[PDB]
Amino acid sequence: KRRNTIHEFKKSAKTTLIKIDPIKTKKVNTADQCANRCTRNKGLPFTCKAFVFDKARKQCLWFPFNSMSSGVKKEFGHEFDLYENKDYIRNCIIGKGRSYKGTVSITKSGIKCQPWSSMIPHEHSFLPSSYRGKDLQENYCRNPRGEEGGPWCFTSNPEVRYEVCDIPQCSEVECMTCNGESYRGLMDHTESGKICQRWDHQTPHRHKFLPERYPDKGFDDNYCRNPDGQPRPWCYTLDPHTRWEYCAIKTCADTTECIQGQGEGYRGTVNTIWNGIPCQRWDSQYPHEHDMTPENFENYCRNPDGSESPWCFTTDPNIRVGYCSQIPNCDQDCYRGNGKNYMGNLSQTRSGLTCSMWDKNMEDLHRHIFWEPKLNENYCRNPDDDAHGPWCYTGNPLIPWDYCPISRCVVNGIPTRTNIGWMVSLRYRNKHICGGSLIKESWVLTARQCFPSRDLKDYEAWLGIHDVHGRGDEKCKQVLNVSQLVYGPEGSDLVLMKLARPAVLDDFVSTIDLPNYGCTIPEKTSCSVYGWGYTGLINYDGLLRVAHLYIMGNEKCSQHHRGKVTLNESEICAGAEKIGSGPCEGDYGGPLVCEQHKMRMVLGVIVPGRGCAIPNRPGIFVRVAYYAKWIHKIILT
């Protein structure tokens, strides 16, 4: 016939055994039929103590030795999987002790069980030749006939022919807890001496558990488990006719209100459901008998099954399960913009970093800031009444201070005649992505909508070019590496880039001043913008292109928007002279700069929104004055 015995094999994952001092592979689809061949009598002349298969190989290689055999090197090879003969690993007695292989030749009276090849002194030694496949060891006692009594070894003693070996029944160590699901041992026999099938297998029962799908429960080769929370662990039967069976195990040796988790480990005195109906006790099967018994693990609403809510049988006969769902489970500002107005018991920044210690923080504050002469340490409340809300100092040497998160209440391109050093050509993937404006010898600004990747070792700054790629002026261009990005306050969407090295100034390269922090604009005031971005023209030579705009109030802006937006002070609105011309793709982060009387400074930044350069429609820009002091307080870095 053709039978299965891999179920009697063990397995291990992603290891291959290399016996340095020695065993053949034949391409066979089924590692399981492979193990069955290894077991099946006379299959190979050598002593197939285990097997290994690699489904990448699909080559079937029996190994006539254990890993406990000396000198064999395991190797973490994913494709290779071992399958051990659990009999050599039993080291105990199952039933008759019929199939033993363990290396023990000690009698019950502590005598060495003779070499079974030794005719001396006792006659019946010829067995290993006679009984081949029983692993009739050199000296170690085996159960030659599958005798009830077990391995009985012909003692070397002159007086006694054989003394029976004694090996414990395996369950001596296979104990259990009342839950039993925690226990994950070797005992792979049912309560009727039946054997559990391999949990990876789908035959003869294709049950629900896929050990990889439900790992962490020890659904290893055949080992009894409690997956469904029975008082006893149980397994699906190797026999197709038995659906499944319990596993015989002995026992082992040696509450509050607020809810944790789904209440499973949690325990409760309360057993009134949201309907108010009290629930009855575990003994009291009434009104309708319940399976759960104290043997499984008062009249309380516990979670023995670990349901979403602990559940107790309504004394109402109609309802089987009632949910005591009133149970409690253990589980920001408005119009106050200055930090002192709120006491923030919060230790985090907006970056997610924790706070720092308010002592050195306080000292550095007083040193840097003498604005005025309270709060707790390491907490969201901030003294300096900062407009962008509550903040906290940070332990980072790169960044010392960050806000803590509490909510409170160019189309028609006209090219530039000459060069502007304020512009910065951001090259990611080695080409311009957005405009940036230089303020310090070591600081540029642009918008947060301009940045795919979070690193720096991709990005690049290009400096002092009138054409897109330094195509004309290879004499004066210069490229810099990126040291840091800084993300602005909430809803700011303003990112400040420091380069790896400040770029020493020159005629061509120009930094820009900041607007007056509290300043207000005059309406229609002409200003200018510069970009290499999309303009709609047939052929962009790569030149910088300049356009002029004129300030305007909220009115006409929302009017052309027809109420698309209700403005905010963050926003600055400026518009064209009834013509279709405005920033578009590739211009983002471009500057709009203006002068008080002659000295010109940035006032807005190109930000993408709501369509490109629709004629007679105003654009919305950032209020640089709305952030200038924050930019300074960070320029402290």
């Binding site: 994913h78 790992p215 319940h290 979403e308 769902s325 997610g352 990747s453 969407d493 999309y534």
Partner: protein, 613 residues
């Protein structure tokens, strides 16, 4: 007798002329915008009057000619030869953030879409503007960005983030059609200002399964939405790369223009459980909505916290088809949020199968900062696949356990939540949902032979003027959410059990609205016993043979229950015998010169004068 009195039930069939509109072709999607119903359909697109249900206008993406030489939008009219295929509108969305636009999509044109703009003077004409979202990729012809619409599966989610239009699209794809056009499972197509193409912000902006599995492991997408910056998805796929079963999953991730950073999938199962088990693999339709006040307590939220509703049907063995057995399931977003974040241990959480492949560097020795990380964008994202599911008790307890449910919508009224179930075959019901008890369908009638589409539109202006739009086959219907009528009710019990927002009251003869009682006998409060028959009609003062009493409204009405203790039965002066085990609100049993027989039920009484000595 019980079947003889089957007239007790409200009739399943009651035909009504509804606001109805017929389609030449099967309907694929629907959009509501400015009192106008835009609906894509087989090779076509239509507009409807919101009140008039009248085709204001329409346009044809009609019989589609395909040429292998042809690009989606390059002209191929002059061509003399070829496939003669048919675009089905798989993706459809109106956008307002830039302009008043409709983004429509063809299935066949390499899955490449178009746009149609609306004038202000008249705001319904679409034949004006046709524009192809077809950005030529001179840079990297590796990836066709505007090739968006998959043929096999399209779930589209449009939003405005960081002042840009973003499309999160989930796509079912076969491995075979990959070389013909390379596409992605889940991709984030961001729409350029110039509105002439989409741009992939990076390489990690797109996710799709390893080229090996793309024959097996079919993952098809069924729903998505936005809430709390987590753009969840509902979709079915294999339990495992080997399982060949299917379990419906919910996916969560954060929305940064770049791409899906913290990508999480969790299994979701709905179980109908009893004392001392049926699990629905396959979600059929869903709807995320606010809860009714009674539901807010019963499941644990406010009137504003968002609850996701999933109508799940049990799957055929090793197959994603349903076993015609469905229920519905509620999921507070708070609970799923916390399950993703904190509840799960550190041993469970796995790496994605279909993306990483089991044999990898990262899956071997990589972990999470679960309690120390939520929505954090780290440049090395970890695709996490929780092994422990979230499972819900059916709120219905199988009040439809014998049937499949094609679709669902949700709405609430006052304190209650009422679900507008669509039946597998197309028997639209409206049913109050509560943990209390089963609610009968105050409407149940059969709409049409064909399945009800999961495409369903809900609206309640002022919570007074309200309606849903429902698709089936080639017709859409505007069903007011305000009920239809009380007359079909055929018991005082059934009449009273109706919701208040339908005005139900027995007019001494049948349930009715108050004003229609000419006799003014309109009552909603006392349920008089009604006799159908008596078996037999001849009895002695001592001789006793079984006494079968057919009728209705016999039991005392408690809010749900109908109690037979609260009843007395008299034979004139002599009280007739009550066999409560054999006596129910439908039928009664007794054991004992013309005489009448008086029932005294929970509310009223009656006499029956067909009896003698």
């Amino acid at each position: 007798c019980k079947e003889a009195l089957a007239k007790s039930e409200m009739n399943v069939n009651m035909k009504y002329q509804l606001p109805n509109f017929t389609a030449e072709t099967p309907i694929q999607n629907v959009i509501l915008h400015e009192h106008h119903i835009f609906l894509g359909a087989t090779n076509y697109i239509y507009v409807l009057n919101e009140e008039d249900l009248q085709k204001v206008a329409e346009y044809k993406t009609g019989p589609v000619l395909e040429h292998p030489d042809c690009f989606p939008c390059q002209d191929c009219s002059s061509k003399a030869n070829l496939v003669w295929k048919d675009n089905i509108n798989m993706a459809l969305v109106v956008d307002t953030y830039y302009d008043d636009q409709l983004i429509s999509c063809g299935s066949v044109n390499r899955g490449t879409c178009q746009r149609h703009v609306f004038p202000h003077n008249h705001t319904a004409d679409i034949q004006s503007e046709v524009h192809c979202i077809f950005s030529p990729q001179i840079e990297e012809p590796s990836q066709c960005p505007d090739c968006v619409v998959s043929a096999l599966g399209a779930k589209v989610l449009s939003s405005v983030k960081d002042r840009f239009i973003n499309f999160f699209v989930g796509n079912t794809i076969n491995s075979s059609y990959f070389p013909d056009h390379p596409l992605h499972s889940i991709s984030v197509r961001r729409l350029k200002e110039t509105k002439d193409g989409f741009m992939f912000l990076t390489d990690q902006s797109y996710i799709d399964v390893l080229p090996e599995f793309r024959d097996s492991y079919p993952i098809k997408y069924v729903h998505a939405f936005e809430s709390n910056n987590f753009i969840y998805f509902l979709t079915v796929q294999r339990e495992t790369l080997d399982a060949q079963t299917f379990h419906t999953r919910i996916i969560r991730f954060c929305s940064i223009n770049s791409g899906l950073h913290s990508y999480m999938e969790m299994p979701l199962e709905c179980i109908l459980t009893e004392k001392r088990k049926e699990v629905f693999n396959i979600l059929q339709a869903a709807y995320v909505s606010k809860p009714g006040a009674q539901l807010a307590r019963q499941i644990g939220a406010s009137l504003n916290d968002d609850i996701l509703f999933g109508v799940f049907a049990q799957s055929k063995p090793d197959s994603a088809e349903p076993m015609d057995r469905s229920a519905m399931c509620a999921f507070p977003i708070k609970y799923v949020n916390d399950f993703f974040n904190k509840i799960v241990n550190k041993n469970n959480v796995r790496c994605l199968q279909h993306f990483y492949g089991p044999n990898h560097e990262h899956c071997f020795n990589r972990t999470l900062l679960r309690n120390s990380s939520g929505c954090e964008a780290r440049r090395d994202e970890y695709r996490t696949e929780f092994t422990t599911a979230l499972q819900r008790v059916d709120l219905f307890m199988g009040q439809f356990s014998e049937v499949l449910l094609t679709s669902i919508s949700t709405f609430i009224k006052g304190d209650l939540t009422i679900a507008n179930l669509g039946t597998s075959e197309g028997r639209f019901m409206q049913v109050v949902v509560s943990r209390s008890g089963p609610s009968t369908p105050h409407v149940n009638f059969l709409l049409d032979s064909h399945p009800v589409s999961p495409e369903v539109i809900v609206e309640h202006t002022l919570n007074q003027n309200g309606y849903t739009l429902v698709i089936t086959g080639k017709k859409i219907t505007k069903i007011p959410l305000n009920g239809l009528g009380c007359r079909h009710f055929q018991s005082c019990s059934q009449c009273l059990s109706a919701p208040p927002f339908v005005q139900c009251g027995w007019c001494h003869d049948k349930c009715v609205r108050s004003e229609e009682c000419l006799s003014g006998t309109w009552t909603q409060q006392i349920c008089l016993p009604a006799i159908y028959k008596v078996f037999p009609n001849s009895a002695p003062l001592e001789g006793g043979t079984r006494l079968t009493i057919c009728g209705w409204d016999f039991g005392f009405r408690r809010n749900n229950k109908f109690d037979l203790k609260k009843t007395r039965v008299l034979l004139g002066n002599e009280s007739c015998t009550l066999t409560l085990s054999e006596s129910t609100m439908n039928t009664l049993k007794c054991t004992v010169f013309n005489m009448s027989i008086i029932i005294s039920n929970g509310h009223g009484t009656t006499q029956y004068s067909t009896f003698s000595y």
